[PDB]
CSV table of C-alpha atoms and ligand atoms in Angstrom, one decimal:
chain,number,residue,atom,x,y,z
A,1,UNK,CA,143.7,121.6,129.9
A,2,UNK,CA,144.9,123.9,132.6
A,3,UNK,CA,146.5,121.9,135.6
A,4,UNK,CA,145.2,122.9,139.2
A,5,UNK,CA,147.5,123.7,141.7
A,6,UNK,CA,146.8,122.7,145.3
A,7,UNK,CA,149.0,124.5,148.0
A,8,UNK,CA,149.3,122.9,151.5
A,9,UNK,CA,150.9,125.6,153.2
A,10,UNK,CA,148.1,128.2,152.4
A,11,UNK,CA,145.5,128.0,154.5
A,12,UNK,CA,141.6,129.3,154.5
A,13,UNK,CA,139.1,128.9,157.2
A,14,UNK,CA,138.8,126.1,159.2
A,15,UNK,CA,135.6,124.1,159.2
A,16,UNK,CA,133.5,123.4,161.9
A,17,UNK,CA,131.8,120.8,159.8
A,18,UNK,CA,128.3,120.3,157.5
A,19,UNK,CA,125.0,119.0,158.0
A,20,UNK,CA,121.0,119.8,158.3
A,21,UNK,CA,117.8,120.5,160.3
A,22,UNK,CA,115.6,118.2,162.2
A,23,UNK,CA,111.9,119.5,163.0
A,24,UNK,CA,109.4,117.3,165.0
A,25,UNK,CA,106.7,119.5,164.9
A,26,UNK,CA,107.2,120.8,161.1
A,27,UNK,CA,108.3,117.8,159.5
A,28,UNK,CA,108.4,114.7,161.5
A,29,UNK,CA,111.7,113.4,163.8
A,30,UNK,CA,114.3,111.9,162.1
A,31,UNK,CA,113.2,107.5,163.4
A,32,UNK,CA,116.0,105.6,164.8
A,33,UNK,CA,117.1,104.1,161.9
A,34,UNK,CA,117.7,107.6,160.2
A,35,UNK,CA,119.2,109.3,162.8
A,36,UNK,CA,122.1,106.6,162.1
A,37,UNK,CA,122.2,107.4,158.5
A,38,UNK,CA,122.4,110.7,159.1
A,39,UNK,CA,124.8,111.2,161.9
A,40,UNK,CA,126.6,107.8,161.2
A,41,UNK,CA,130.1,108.4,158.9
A,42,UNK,CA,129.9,104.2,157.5
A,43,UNK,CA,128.9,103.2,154.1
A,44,UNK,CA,125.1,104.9,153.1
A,45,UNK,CA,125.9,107.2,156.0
A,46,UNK,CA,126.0,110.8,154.9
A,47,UNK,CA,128.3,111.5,157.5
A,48,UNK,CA,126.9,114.6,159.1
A,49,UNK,CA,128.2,116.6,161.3
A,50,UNK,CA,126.3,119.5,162.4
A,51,UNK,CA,122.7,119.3,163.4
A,52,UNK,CA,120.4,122.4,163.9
A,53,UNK,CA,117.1,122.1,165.8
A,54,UNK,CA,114.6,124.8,166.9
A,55,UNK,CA,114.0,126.9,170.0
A,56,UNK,CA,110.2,126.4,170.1
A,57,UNK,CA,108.1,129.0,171.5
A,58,UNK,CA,106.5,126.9,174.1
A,59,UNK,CA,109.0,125.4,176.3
A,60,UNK,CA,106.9,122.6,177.5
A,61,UNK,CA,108.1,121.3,174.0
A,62,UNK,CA,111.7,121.7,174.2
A,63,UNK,CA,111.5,117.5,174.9
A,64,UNK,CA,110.5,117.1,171.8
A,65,UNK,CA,114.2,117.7,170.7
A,66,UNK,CA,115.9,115.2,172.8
A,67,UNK,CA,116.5,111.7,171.4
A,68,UNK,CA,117.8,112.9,168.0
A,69,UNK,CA,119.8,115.9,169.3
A,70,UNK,CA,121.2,112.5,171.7
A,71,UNK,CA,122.1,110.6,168.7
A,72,UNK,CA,123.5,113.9,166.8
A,73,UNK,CA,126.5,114.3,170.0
A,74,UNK,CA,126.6,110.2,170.2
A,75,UNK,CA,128.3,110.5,166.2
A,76,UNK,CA,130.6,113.5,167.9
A,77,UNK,CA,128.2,116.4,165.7
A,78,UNK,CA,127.7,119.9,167.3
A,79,UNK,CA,123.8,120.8,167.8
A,80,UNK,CA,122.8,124.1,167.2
A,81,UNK,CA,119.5,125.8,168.1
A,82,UNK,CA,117.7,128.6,166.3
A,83,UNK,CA,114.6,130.4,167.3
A,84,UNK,CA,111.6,131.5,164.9
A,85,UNK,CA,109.3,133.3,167.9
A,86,UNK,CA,109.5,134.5,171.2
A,87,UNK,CA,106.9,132.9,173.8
A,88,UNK,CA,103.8,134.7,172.7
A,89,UNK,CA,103.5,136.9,175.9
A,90,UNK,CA,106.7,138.9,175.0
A,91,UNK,CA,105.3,139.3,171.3
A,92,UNK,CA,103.6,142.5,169.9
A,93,UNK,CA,102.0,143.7,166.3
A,94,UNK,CA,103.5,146.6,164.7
A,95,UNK,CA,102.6,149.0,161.9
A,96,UNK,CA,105.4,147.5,159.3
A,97,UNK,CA,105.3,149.9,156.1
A,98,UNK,CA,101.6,149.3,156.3
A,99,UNK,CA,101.6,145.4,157.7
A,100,UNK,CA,99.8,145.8,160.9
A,101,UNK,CA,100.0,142.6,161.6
A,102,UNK,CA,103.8,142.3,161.9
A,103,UNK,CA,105.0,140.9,165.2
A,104,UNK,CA,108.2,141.9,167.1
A,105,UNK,CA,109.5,141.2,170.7
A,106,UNK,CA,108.5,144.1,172.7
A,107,UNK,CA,111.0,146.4,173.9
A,108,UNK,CA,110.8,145.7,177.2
A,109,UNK,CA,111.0,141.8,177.2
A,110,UNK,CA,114.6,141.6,175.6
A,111,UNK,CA,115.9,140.5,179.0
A,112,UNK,CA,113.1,137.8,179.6
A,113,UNK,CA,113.6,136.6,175.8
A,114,UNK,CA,117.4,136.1,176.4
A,115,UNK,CA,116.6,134.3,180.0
A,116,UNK,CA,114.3,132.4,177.4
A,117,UNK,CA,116.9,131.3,175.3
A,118,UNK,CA,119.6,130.7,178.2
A,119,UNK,CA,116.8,128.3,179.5
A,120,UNK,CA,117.0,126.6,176.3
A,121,UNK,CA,120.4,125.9,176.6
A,122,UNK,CA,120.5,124.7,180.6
A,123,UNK,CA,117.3,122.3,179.4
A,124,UNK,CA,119.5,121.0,176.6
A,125,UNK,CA,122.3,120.4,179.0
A,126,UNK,CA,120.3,118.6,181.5
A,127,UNK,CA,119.5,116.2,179.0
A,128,UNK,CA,122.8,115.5,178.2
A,129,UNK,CA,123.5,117.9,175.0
A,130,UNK,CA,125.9,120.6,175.6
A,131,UNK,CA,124.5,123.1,172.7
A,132,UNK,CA,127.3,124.4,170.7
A,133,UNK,CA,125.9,127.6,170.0
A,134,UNK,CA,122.4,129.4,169.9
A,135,UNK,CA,120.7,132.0,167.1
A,136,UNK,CA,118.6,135.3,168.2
A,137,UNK,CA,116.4,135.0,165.4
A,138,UNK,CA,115.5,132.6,162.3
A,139,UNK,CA,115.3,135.4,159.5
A,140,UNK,CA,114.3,137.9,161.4
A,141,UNK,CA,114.3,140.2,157.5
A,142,UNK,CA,111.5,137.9,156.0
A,143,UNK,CA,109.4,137.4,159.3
A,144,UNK,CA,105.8,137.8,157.7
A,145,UNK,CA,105.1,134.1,159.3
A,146,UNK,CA,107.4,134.7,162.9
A,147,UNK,CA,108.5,137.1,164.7
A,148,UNK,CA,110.2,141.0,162.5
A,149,UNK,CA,113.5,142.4,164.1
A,150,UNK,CA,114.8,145.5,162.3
A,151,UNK,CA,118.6,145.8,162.0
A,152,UNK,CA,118.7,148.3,164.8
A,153,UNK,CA,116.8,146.0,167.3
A,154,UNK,CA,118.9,143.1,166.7
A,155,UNK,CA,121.8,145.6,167.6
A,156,UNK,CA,120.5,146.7,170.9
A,157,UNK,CA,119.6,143.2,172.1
A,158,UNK,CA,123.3,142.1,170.9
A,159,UNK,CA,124.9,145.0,173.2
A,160,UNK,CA,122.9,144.7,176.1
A,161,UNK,CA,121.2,141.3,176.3
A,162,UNK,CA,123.4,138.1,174.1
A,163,UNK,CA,126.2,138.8,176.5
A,164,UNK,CA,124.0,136.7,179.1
A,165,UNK,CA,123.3,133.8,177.1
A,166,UNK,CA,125.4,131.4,178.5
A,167,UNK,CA,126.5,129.3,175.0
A,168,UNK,CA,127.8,131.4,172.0
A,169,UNK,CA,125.8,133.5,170.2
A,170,UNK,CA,124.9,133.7,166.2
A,171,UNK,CA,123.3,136.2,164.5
A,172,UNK,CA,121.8,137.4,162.7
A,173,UNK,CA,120.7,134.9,160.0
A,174,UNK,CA,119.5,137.1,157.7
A,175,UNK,CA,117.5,135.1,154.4
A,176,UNK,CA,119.7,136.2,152.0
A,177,UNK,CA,123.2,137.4,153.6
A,178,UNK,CA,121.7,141.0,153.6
A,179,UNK,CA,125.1,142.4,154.7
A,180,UNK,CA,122.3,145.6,155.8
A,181,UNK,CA,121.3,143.2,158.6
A,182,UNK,CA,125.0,142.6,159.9
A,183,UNK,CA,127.1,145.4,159.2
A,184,UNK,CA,125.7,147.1,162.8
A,185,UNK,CA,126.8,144.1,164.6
A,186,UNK,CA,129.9,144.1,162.9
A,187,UNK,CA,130.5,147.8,163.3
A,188,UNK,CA,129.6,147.9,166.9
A,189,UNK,CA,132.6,147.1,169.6
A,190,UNK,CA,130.0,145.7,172.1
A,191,UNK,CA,127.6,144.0,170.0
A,192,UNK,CA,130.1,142.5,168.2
A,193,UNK,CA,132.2,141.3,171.6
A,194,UNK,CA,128.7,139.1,172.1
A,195,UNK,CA,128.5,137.6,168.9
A,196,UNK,CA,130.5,134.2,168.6
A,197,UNK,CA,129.5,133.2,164.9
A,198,UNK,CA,128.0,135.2,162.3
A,199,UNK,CA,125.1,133.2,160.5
A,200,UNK,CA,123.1,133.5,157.4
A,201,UNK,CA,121.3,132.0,155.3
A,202,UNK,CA,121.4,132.0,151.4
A,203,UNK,CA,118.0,131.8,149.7
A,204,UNK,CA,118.1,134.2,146.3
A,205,UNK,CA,122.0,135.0,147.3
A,206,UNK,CA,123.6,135.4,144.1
A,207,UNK,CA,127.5,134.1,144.3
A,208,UNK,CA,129.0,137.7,143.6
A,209,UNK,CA,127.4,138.7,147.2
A,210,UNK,CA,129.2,135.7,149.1
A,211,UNK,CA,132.3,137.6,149.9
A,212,UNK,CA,131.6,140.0,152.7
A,213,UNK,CA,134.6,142.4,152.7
A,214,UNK,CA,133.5,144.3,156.4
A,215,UNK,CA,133.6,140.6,157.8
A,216,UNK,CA,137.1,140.3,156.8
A,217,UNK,CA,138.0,143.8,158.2
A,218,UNK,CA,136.3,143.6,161.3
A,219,UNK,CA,135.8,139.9,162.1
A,220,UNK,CA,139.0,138.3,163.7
A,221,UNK,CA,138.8,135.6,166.0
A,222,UNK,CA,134.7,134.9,165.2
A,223,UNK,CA,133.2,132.4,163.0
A,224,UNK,CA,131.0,132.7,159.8
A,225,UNK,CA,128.8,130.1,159.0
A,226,UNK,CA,126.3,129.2,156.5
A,227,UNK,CA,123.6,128.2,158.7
A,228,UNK,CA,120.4,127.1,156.2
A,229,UNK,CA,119.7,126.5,152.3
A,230,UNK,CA,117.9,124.2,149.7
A,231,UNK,CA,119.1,124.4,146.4
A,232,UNK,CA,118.7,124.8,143.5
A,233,UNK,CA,114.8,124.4,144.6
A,234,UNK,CA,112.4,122.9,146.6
A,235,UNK,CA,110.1,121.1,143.9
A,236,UNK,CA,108.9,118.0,145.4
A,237,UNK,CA,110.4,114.3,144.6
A,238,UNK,CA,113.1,116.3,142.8
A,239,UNK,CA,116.3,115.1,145.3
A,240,UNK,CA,117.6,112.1,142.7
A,241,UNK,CA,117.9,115.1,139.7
A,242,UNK,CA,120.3,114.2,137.4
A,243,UNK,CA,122.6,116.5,136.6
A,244,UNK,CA,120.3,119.1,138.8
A,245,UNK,CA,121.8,117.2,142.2
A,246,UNK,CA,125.7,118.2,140.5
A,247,UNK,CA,124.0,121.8,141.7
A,248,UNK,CA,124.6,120.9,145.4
A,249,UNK,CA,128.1,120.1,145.2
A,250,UNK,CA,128.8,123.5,143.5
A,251,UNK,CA,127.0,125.3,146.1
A,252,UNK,CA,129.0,124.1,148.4
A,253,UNK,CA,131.8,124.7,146.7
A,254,UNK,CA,131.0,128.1,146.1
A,255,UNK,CA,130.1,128.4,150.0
A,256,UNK,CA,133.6,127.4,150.8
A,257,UNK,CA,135.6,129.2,148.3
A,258,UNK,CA,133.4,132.8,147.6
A,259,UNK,CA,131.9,132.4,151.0
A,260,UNK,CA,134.8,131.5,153.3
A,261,UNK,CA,132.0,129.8,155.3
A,262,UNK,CA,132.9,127.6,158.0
A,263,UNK,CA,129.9,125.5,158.1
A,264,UNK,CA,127.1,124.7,155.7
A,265,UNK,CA,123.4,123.6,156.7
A,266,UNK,CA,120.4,122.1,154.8
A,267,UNK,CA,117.0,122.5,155.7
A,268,UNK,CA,114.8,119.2,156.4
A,269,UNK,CA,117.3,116.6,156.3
A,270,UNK,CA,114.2,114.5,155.4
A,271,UNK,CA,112.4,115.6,152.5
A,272,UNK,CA,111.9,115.0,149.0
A,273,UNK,CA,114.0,117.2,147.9
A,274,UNK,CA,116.5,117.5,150.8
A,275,UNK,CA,119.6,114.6,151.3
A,276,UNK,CA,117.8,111.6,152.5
A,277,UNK,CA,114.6,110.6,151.0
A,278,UNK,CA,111.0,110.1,152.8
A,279,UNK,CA,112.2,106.4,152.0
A,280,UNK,CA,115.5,107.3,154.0
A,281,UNK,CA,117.5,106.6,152.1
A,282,UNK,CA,120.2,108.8,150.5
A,283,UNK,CA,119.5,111.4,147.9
A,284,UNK,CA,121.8,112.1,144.7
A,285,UNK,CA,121.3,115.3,146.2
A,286,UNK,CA,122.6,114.0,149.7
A,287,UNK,CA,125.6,112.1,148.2
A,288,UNK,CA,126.7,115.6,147.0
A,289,UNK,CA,126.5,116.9,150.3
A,290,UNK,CA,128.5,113.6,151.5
A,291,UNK,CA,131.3,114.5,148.9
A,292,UNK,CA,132.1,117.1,151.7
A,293,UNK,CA,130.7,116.1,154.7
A,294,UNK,CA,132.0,112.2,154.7
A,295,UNK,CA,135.7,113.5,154.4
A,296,UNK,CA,136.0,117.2,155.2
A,297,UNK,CA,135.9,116.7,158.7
A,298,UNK,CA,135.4,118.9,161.9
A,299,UNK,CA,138.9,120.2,162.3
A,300,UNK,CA,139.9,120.4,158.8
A,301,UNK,CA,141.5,123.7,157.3
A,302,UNK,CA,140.7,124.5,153.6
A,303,UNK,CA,143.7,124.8,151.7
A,304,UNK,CA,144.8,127.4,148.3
A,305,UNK,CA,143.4,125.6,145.2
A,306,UNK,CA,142.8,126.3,141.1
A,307,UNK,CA,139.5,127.1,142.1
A,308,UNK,CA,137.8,126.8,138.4
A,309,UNK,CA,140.9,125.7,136.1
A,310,UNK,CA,139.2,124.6,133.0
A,311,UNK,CA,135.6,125.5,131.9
A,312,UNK,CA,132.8,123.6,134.0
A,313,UNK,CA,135.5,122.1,136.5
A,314,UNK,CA,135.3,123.3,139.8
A,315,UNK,CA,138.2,122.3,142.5
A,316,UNK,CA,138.6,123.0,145.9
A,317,UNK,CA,141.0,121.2,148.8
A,318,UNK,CA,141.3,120.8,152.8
A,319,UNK,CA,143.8,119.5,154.8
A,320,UNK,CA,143.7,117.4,158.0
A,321,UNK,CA,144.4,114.4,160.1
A,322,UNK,CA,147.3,113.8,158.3
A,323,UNK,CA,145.4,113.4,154.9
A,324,UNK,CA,144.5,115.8,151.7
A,325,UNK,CA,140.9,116.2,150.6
A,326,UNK,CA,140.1,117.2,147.0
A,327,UNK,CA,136.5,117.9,145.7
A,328,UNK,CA,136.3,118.1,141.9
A,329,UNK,CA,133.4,118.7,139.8
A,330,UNK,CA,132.5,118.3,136.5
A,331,UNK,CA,129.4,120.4,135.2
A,332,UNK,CA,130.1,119.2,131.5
A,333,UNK,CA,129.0,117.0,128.9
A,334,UNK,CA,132.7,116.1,128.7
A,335,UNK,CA,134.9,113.1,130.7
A,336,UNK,CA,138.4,115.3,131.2
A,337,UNK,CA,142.0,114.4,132.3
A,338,UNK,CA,142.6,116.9,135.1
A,339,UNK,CA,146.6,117.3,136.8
A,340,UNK,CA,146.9,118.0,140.2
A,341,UNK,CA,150.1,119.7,141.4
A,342,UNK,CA,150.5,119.6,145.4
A,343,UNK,CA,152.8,122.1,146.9
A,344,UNK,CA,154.5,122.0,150.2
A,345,UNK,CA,153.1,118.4,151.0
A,346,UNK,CA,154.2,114.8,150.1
A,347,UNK,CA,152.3,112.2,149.3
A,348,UNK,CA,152.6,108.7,147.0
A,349,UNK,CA,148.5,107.5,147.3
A,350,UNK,CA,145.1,108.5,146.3
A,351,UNK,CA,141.7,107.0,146.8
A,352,UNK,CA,138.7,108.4,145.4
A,353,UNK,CA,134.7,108.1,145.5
A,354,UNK,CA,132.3,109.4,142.5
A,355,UNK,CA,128.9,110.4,142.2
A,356,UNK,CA,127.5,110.4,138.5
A,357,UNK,CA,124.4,109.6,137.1
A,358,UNK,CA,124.3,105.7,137.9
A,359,UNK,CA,127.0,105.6,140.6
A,360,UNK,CA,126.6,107.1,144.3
A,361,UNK,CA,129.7,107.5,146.4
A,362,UNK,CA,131.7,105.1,144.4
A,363,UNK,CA,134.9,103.8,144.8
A,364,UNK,CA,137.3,104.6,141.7
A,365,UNK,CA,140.7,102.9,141.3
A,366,UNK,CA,143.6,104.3,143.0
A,367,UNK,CA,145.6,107.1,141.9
A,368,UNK,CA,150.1,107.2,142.6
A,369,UNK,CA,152.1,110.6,143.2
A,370,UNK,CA,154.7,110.8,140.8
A,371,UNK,CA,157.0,114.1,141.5
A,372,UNK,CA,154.4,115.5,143.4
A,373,UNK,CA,151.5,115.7,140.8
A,374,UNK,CA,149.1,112.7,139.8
A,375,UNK,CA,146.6,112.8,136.9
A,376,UNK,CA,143.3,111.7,136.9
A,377,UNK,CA,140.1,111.5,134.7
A,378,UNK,CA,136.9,113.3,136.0
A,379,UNK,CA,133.7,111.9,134.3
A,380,UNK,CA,131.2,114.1,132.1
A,381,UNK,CA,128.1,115.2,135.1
A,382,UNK,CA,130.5,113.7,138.4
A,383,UNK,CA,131.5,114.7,141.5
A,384,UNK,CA,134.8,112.9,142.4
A,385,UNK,CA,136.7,113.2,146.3
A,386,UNK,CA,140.1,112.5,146.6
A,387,UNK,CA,141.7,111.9,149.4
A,388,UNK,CA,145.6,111.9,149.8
A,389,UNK,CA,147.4,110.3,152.7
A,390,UNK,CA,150.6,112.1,153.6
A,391,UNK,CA,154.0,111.2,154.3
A,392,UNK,CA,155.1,113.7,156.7
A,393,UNK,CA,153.2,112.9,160.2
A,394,UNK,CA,154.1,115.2,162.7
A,395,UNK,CA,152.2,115.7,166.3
A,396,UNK,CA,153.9,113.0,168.8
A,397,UNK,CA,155.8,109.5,168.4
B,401,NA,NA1,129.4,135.9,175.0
């Protein structure tokens, strides 16, 4: 077997952190008791750390948002918010390639849309959740049941109307990371000055399309984020899939290593195919998401690693608060002995937690640093985190 190398002093992206959405009127609230499991980072907590809501349409139901959006910044997770429509008085049908019942804002209400969404925001506040950031549009390229933008409307509300939204600004959360939809933002000085984070969604997106090379070129100083998936599918009861759920974890992975993405966001958190069961309990599907978003937290840089050193084994590594995070998965039929070489960074310990087939978020036995490498066995159809406590603290004291 090929060893994996895992560089400390080369860093990636830093990540803003990982989570889902939460829908009252589509799906239910999240209760009490699962608004700890999901926000809470303790054992059967999935630890997460970013929760999107919606914008709806009709403010009188922005309240509707409150108490779990409370409990979200309680656990110390951003919230984001994401429209699908504009109140229906700024809303118009189109002729679209036939479709003459495609609706888009109308031209003229851009300013009262974006006063719209800054009320949003100052409602949010006023109930104690400073909103970390708010979309323009939910898909606004697969909008036959909300609201069509084309990519040139999204760019003239980005020049002359986001710049008044007082929060930061995504867009444009295209379905698919239909780099179409972007590249004008991206392209275009002003419109790009408004944007704060880049969003989009993956549905279809094959992996050879999650590097975005303009993004690199022109993107400096903003943030990319992966901001709403299920996958591999939405068939129903199929969350506890085993070795289906393994598909998670290497979404993720590919997400943070093809991707670069800063952030990564279910759909429901509550459904029978999304991380916590209508039971609420915690998915096999969820546990993979906890692989990352239980240890990789807010703050955390990823780090140069072996990304794929051995058929069906897929590695990648973070760095922060003084520790080393390692994610390796095993997609075979096949228990292997992997090395791990860390560069530029000591360390003598290792703990680690595996999901497998029978065994959620498990604790294995510890690992020692010998010469700066350790071995150690990943299971046929497993997920294992590592995490690697330092020996060189810095900061203060
Ligand atoms: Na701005």
């Amino acid at each position: 077997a090929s060893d994996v190398t895992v560089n400390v002093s080369a860093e990636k992206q830093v990540i803003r952190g990982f989570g889902g959405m939460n829908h009252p009127a589509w799906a239910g609230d999240l209760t009490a008791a699962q608004r700890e499991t999901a926000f809470g980072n303790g054992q059967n907590q999935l630890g997460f750390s970013i929760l999107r809501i919606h914008v709806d349409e009709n403010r009188n139901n922005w309240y509707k948002e409150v108490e779990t959006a409370k409990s979200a910044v309680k656990h110390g997770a951003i919230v984001f918010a994401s429209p699908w429509n504009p109140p229906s008085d700024m809303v118009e049908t189109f002729n679209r390639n036939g479709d003459t019942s495609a609706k888009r804002l109308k031209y003229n209400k851009y300013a009262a849309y974006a006063q719209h969404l800054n009320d949003f925001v100052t409602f949010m506040k006023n109930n104690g959740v400073n909103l970390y950031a708010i979309s323009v549009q939910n898909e606004p390229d697969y909008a036959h049941e909300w609201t069509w933008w084309t990519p040139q409307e999204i760019l003239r509300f980005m020049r002359e109307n986001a710049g008044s939204i007082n929060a930061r600004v995504i867009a444009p959360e295209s379905f698919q990371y239909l780099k179409n939809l972007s590249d004008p933002i991206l392209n275009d000085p002003q419109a790009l000055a408004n944007m704060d984070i880049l969003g989009t969604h993956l549905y279809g997106t094959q992996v050879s399309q999650f590097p975005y090379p303009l993004f690199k070129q022109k993107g400096a100083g903003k943030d990319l984020w992966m901001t709403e998936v299920y996958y591999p599918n939405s068939d129903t009861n199929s969350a506890d899939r085993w070795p289906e759920a393994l598909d998670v974890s290497q979404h993720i992975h590919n997400a943070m290593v093809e991707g670069d993405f800063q952030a990564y966001v279910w759909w429901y958190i509550r459904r029978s195919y999304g991380p916590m069961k209508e039971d609420g309990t915690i998915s096999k599907r969820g546990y993979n998401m906890a692989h990352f978003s239980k240890f990789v937290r807010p703050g955390y840089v990823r780090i140069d690693a072996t990304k794929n050193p051995n058929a069906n084994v897929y590695v990648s590594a973070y760095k922060g608060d003084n520790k080393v995070v390692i994610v390796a998965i095993n997609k075979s039929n096949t228990g292997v002995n992997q090395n791990f070489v860390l560069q530029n960074g000591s360390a003598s310990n290792v703990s680690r937690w595996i999901t497998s087939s029978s065994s959620n978020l498990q604790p294995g036995t510890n690992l020692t640093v010998s010469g700066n490498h350790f071995w150690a066995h990943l299971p046929a159809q497993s997920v294992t985190t590592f995490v690697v406590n330092r020996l060189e603290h810095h900061h203060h004291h």
